Design a protein around this nucleic acid. Sequence first.
RNA 1: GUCCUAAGGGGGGCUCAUGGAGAACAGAAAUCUCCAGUAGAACAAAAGGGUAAAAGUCCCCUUGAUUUUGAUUUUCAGUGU
RNA 2: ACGUACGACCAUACCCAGUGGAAAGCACGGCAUCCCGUCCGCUCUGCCCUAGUUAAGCCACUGAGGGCCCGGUUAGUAGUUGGGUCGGUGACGACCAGCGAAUCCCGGGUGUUGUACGU
Lengths: 65, 129, 258, 188, 286, 169
Amino acid sequence: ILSVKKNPSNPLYTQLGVLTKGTIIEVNVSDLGIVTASGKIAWGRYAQITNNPENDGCVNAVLLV
Amino acid sequence: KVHAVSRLAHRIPGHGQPILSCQFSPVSSSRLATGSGDNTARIWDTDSGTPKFTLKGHTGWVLGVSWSPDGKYLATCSMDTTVRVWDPESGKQVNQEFRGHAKWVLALAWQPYHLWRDGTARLASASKD
Amino acid sequence: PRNARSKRALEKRAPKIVENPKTCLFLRGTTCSQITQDAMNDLYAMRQVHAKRFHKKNAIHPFEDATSLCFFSEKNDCSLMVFGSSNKKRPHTLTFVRMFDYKVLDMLEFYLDPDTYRSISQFKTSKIPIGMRPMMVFAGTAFESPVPNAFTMAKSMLIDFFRGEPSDKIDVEGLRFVVVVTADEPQKPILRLRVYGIRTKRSGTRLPRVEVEEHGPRMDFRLGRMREPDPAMLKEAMKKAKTPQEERTKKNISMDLL
Amino acid sequence: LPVTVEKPTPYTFDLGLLLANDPNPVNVPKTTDTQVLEQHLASVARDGAQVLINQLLTTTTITATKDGVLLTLPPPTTPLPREKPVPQPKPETKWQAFARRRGIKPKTREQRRNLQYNPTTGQWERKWGYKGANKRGETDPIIEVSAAKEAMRPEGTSVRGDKRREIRARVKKNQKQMLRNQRIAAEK
Amino acid sequence: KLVKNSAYYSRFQTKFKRRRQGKTDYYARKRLITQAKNKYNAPKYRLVVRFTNRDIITQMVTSEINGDKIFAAAYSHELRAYGINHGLTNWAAAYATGLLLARRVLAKLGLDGEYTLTEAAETEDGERRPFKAILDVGLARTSTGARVFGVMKGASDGGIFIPHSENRFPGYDIETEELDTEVLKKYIYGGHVAEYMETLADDDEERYKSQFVKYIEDDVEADSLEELYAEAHKQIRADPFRKYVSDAPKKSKEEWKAESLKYKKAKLSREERKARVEAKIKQLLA
Amino acid sequence: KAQNPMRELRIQKLVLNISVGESGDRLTRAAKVLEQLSGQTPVYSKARYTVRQFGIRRNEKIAVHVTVRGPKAEEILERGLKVKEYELRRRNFSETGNFGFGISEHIDLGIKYDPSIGIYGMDFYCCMTRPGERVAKRRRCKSRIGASHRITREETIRWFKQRFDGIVR
RNA sequence: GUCCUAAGGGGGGCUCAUGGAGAACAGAAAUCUCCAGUAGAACAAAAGGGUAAAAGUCCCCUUGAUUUUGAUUUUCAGUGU
RNA sequence: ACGUACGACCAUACCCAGUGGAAAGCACGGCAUCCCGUCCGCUCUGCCCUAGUUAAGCCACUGAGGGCCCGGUUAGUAGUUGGGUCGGUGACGACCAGCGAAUCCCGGGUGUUGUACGU
């Protein structure tokens, strides 16, 4: 995880970095091997958390592509 | 000296499925052969970036294209357990398809030109069987 | 500025940390000879991309009053001016005017020799491409006076004229023309302006052998009247601003290579 | 032919401006022959161009890119006057001085966005501007009207222009404050 | 009242000479030559494409302060040395002329004693860079299927790096955002002309004969045009500097000077003008 | 040099105009009338200014016109001259060599009357030219037509009299 | 008191005010045509040289209403991603 | 020298009219299947270069009326700064200098030119 972009409930929760469902996070995508049209390597993208991490013990997210 | 390629020369569409094999003609870079998953091979004129021929007859993905060393034949091997030979100057199949492989034909290798005998060429096809 | 285009023009004219390349306005007085106009045309042809041209006759004597010059500079956003004039006392005169904040910073008169003057069209050579800045050579002992004088101001003015657009990189194919100004310390000394095209030949080493061929124009100048800057205005104009990409060095703090 | 010139005093350079300074005197011959004068001047130009080319090809970083062969140039060191004074911070407005005194922080760019979620419609809408939330109900088919407000309402006016009236009053007050700040800053 | 008075004539400001002639868009020319993304002091080349009634003119141009410089030039009437004698303004001739200009540029540069600073300062890890030029269409309309883009396609296939997109070639579909390479190949080899000849010979035989009278006279069938243009492209790539001699009269330059001075009309002298003025005054008095 | 084939007069264009002065159904029906008179969709013109005396408004669609070229223009002008009995006035011809006339009813052109459409008149204006008018109309190298190539009022009157066997009074 | 897929940006086509001569109603003033028209119109500013194949005016595309990154500039930060 | 394509100076080149133009080239021209765009194949775009024509465009020459552009004269004069330097208490009247016009008048002119390919 690179950062926390937007927690939908509260900007204070965004500032505190809370990982709940629907939160937009920034992820390091160096492992996925994404090259832009100009040949540059994209290594940071946005993903949305799709689960309830406080209940699950883990963070599940889906890339916003 | 060969100079490094630095930019796009041409982008030619026409294949309806992913391109699985490609090979230049041994005579020059003017002729290119590609073989795709739309059960066709295609000859391209690379001077103008245009299609030249479409080779049809396979009922599976054309896994391999291979020019003859003298450049007078093109062999295609496909997922339909067959190998076909084509005349690259007319786009027509030479004689009939080659039958006898039970599973997918994966690779082709022409006999070298200086080893040809009995007035014919020989072609090795390696298959999944 | 209700219009977005006028807002863009105002922002272009606004003071900046990294300044725009200077624009030169070429204008003439009520009496201006054909030799002076040809000299002005040659200078404009050398500086086409960042110049504007006036075509009317202006009743301006710059060393008496420069209110119209300040008005023209404010209207056209031109900080360099070339003023052409002619007289019985001064037969062919080019007045270089450099301004600061739409007010006259300094002024210098050049007296052109008519007999030795040759235009660019009088040389049968391949000319400089439009917008290409040339290299520069200043030669002689007249440009190292310990006290600022007319030749020092002439060197500064000619640098501001042939400066062009600054760039951190240059193509090696863009070094084909050189501008040479020669002047010696001493009845008046002659400031000579020449332009040459550059040819390179193999010499058996890594460095090439340079050869020059005359490009034009051919100009002989005598320095005349001078208007020196106010010291406070000079300090304001010679102040240098730091870009945001120039880090202010902190004690014991640095950046590693990663 | 040599590629190095030898002079009693070495050249100085400013490679940001592609400038070579020659301290040595130009011994122009005291002749009336334009031709000998011209190959003397051309020889001086030849030495200057040669030493400039040598300095540029030996003391700068050379990089071969798709654009061409480029020389990394230093920033210019010859002192030249500016055309306009160095920009200075603007005088503080009344709001700016008040906010500095009271410790009021600037709002974040996410905080000041012209977007909000209307839950009644379940839609994203602009707070101000075209079809903004500050003009809500001015195009609705039905508006409830208070009897006292419609009794106190002047003749000719409608309830459909009240929000535009309030917006015009707010804009007028803000514009008056801005003009006062501009006049004070111009006085300073 | 008279609008065209002395005050109007004194106040009048003329346009540029080529603007008055209607030949040059100076608004476009300023951005074509005096505008650059980088400030590397590098020279810039433009491929000028122009069309007349009977010819196609392609030039490779740099801009200097005393006037433009033609690095190389190819004309569609030079395709007669390669075997094309009809349709010297059509799309296939445009493609062939662009290809000829590209091969001439590359052969003049040697990409098919004095030496340059690029060779003087070439690094070990340095590859050959393509020749770069930008298209200059002038006043022509840049619609889809225009022949200026055929000239550009011919030059880019010949080897000149010209920045361009493909949405102005024939066969491009706006809705699907795709290029029909079959239609593009047909237009390159002149098959639109061939289908016109077939359709005209089927429908309107008299119009067919009148329009393609030279084709039938020289026995250029519609089914041979693709082979003719392919052979022309191969011969252009083989020999880009083949000499062509026209059927026009041939004299030397001095002979043409004499021929033109035989028909030039001399300016009247001051003495002759004064004599004519005196004769007019005498005629007015009489 | 007056017998040069490139000086031969011909009809450049014919413009049919209907100025009803009112927007809506009347303009729509006049536009339909022009449509099946010519064979192409007409042009609706907007008012330049607001005139309270004429009851018109700025940017209000008040008139309709069609430009017709070629043999269609020739035959439509022939029908108009048949309506006007091949007779024109000397004031109808302009100094530049063009002419025109007007009709009050459009049934007599050869259009069957329809009760839902109604009555409409129109203005015919025929603009003449010689070959070489492209010199002033092309984009590249746009120039002026020469004075000897310009068309005069006597020339177009003579052309009308010779061509249609008409009378100019 | 009304109306608008907002303004802006890029590209392309076109040339304006006015005058003369013509065209049923139409008559100083409605629309159409030609010619002449250095801008005398429009749009910005307050030229002592703003802009004419445009900076004017109509079409096409975007309209996503204030993007991302920064070890750098200035200010702030008891909530220092 | 002439023509064409890109140009440079941007009226000595502009406004109006008349006469002429070998060669080639420009051009007017011819035709609307395809690409493309219009109320209208007018323009734009595509196809022919055959056929007609120099009538116009273009080029050259001439002509008025304007305009415009060079050079001299005005004239180192008006005007303006300096007790600057002599008188005048002073202001100022000369003188000395520094800068420095324009009107009028006279004479001449109405395009030069780069690169490439051709006639």
